[PDB]
Design an enzyme around this catalytic site. Structure first.
Site, mmCIF file in Angstrom:
data_model
loop_
_atom_site.group_PDB
_atom_site.id
_atom_site.type_symbol
_atom_site.label_atom_id
_atom_site.label_comp_id
_atom_site.label_asym_id
_atom_site.label_seq_id
_atom_site.Cartn_x
_atom_site.Cartn_y
_atom_site.Cartn_z
ATOM 1 N N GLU A 35 0.809 -1.213 0.000
ATOM 2 C CA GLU A 35 0.000 0.000 0.000
ATOM 3 C C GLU A 35 0.848 1.271 0.000
ATOM 4 O OE1 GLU A 35 -3.123 0.355 -0.512
ATOM 5 O OE2 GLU A 35 -3.973 -1.639 -0.135
ATOM 6 N N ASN A 46 -7.884 9.181 -5.653
ATOM 7 C CA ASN A 46 -8.745 8.230 -6.348
ATOM 8 C C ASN A 46 -9.594 8.939 -7.402
ATOM 9 O OD1 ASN A 46 -9.187 6.939 -3.063
ATOM 10 N ND2 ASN A 46 -7.991 5.936 -4.650
ATOM 11 N N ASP A 48 -12.762 8.881 -7.859
ATOM 12 C CA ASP A 48 -13.996 9.466 -7.350
ATOM 13 C C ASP A 48 -13.772 10.749 -6.560
ATOM 14 O OD1 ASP A 48 -12.996 8.607 -4.885
ATOM 15 O OD2 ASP A 48 -14.554 7.119 -4.539
ATOM 16 N N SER A 50 -11.897 10.953 -3.758
ATOM 17 C CA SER A 50 -11.441 10.687 -2.408
ATOM 18 C C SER A 50 -9.925 10.524 -2.440
ATOM 19 C CB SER A 50 -12.136 9.445 -1.862
ATOM 20 O OG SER A 50 -11.756 8.292 -2.595
ATOM 21 N N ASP A 52 -6.503 8.438 -0.367
ATOM 22 C CA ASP A 52 -5.995 7.433 0.566
ATOM 23 C C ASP A 52 -4.767 7.951 1.326
ATOM 24 O OD1 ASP A 52 -7.919 5.689 -0.520
ATOM 25 O OD2 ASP A 52 -6.497 4.814 -1.891
ATOM 26 N N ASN A 59 -9.067 5.446 3.274
ATOM 27 C CA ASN A 59 -9.754 6.300 2.306
ATOM 28 C C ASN A 59 -10.696 7.309 2.956
ATOM 29 O OD1 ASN A 59 -12.431 6.462 0.375
ATOM 30 N ND2 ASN A 59 -10.493 6.575 -0.742
#
Ligand code: CL
Ligand code: CL
Ligand code: NA
Ligand code: NA
EC number: 3.2.1.17
Length: 129
Positions: A35, A46, A48, A50, A52, A59
């Site tokens: 990650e 991301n 959309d 959002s 992380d 998220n």
């Protein structure tokens, strides 16, 4: 902070993640490697809108508030910036909520695709724990 492999394993063990909800320590270390490459300051945006955050790439649509993800929940009740600290406590406490929500560690796409079904014990081999 960029952790070493065994340094992070030890920190996660002290914070209660070894066998948490049945996931052995090597699973958590493997997920952190893919990650974030063990970097607490990692961020990724991301599609959309959002973002992380942190060593476990938590998220902002569901788990933390970053002030720029409209319609988001803050289910861990934390600003997302707290997840970037050299102190992993906030990331660990939030991850415990995530892994308990029904889907286990499948919530982490890199765990599903790169750790699940592999010899995850290798990630803690050689560490003094
Ligand atoms: Cl393990
Ligand atoms: Cl992946
Ligand atoms: Na180390
Ligand atoms: Na949010």
């Amino acid at each position: 902070k960029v952790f070493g492999r065994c340094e992070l394993a030890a920190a996660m063990k002290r914070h209660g993640l070894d066998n948490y909800r049945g996931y052995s320590l090597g699973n958590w270390v493997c997920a952190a490697k893919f990650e974030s490459n063990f970097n607490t300051q990692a961020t990724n945006r991301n599609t959309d809108g959002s973002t992380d955050y942190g060593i476990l790439q938590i998220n902002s649509r569901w788990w933390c508030n970053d002030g720029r993800t409209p319609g988001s929940r803050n289910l861990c009740n934390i600003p997302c910036s707290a997840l970037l600290s050299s102190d992993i406590t906030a990331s660990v406490n939030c991850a415990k909520k995530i892994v308990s929500d029904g889907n286990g560690m499948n919530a982490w796409v890199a765990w599903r695709n790169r750790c699940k079904g592999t010899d995850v014990q290798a990630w803690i081999r050689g560490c003094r724990l």
